[PDB]
Amino acid sequence: MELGELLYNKSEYIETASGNKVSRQSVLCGSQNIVLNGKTIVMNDCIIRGDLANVRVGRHCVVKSRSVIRPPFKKFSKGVAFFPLHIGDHVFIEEDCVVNAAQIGSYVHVGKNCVIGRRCVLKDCCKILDNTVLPPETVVPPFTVFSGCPGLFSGELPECTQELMIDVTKSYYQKFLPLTQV
């Protein structure tokens, strides 16, 4: 089953030099600090909070609408500060997501209506099924589904996730073409 068409009106999007397609309605905060590596899709009502720490995001990742990327807060012994958030290449974040993960690897897929606890670490090629909460300090190993409330390991992904996911994200970018201005 190929990725279906998903058209957008060209007026409320910004296409950048690197190829990032960031929606106008997305709430970018501290945009001087945010870094997108190109070919990124940030949909409407996305609250990317770069005003607290470095929020770097990899290539071809998709951040669906109404999703918040907020870097976590860590209380270390020497004092207090905000940990920078890092997201790898080819990450598919579904809508209505809440992300407080310290690190999200590459080839990751977060299900819709998901909340990720503070300072979580998501290794590469992991899935989180829909309507799932990951409490803080939860480490998802590669090739595992973390589902339920709380998210518990309840399966393993197929072998070819590194290939399937990079196909899916590329198809999503290639099929996210602007509406016909007729």
Binding site: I14, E15, T16, S31, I34, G50
Partner: peptide, 15 residues
Amino acid sequence: STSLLSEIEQSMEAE
């Protein structure tokens, strides 16, 4: 690295 603010400014310049 090219910060997202720089890309937004370049897009504004293009318009």
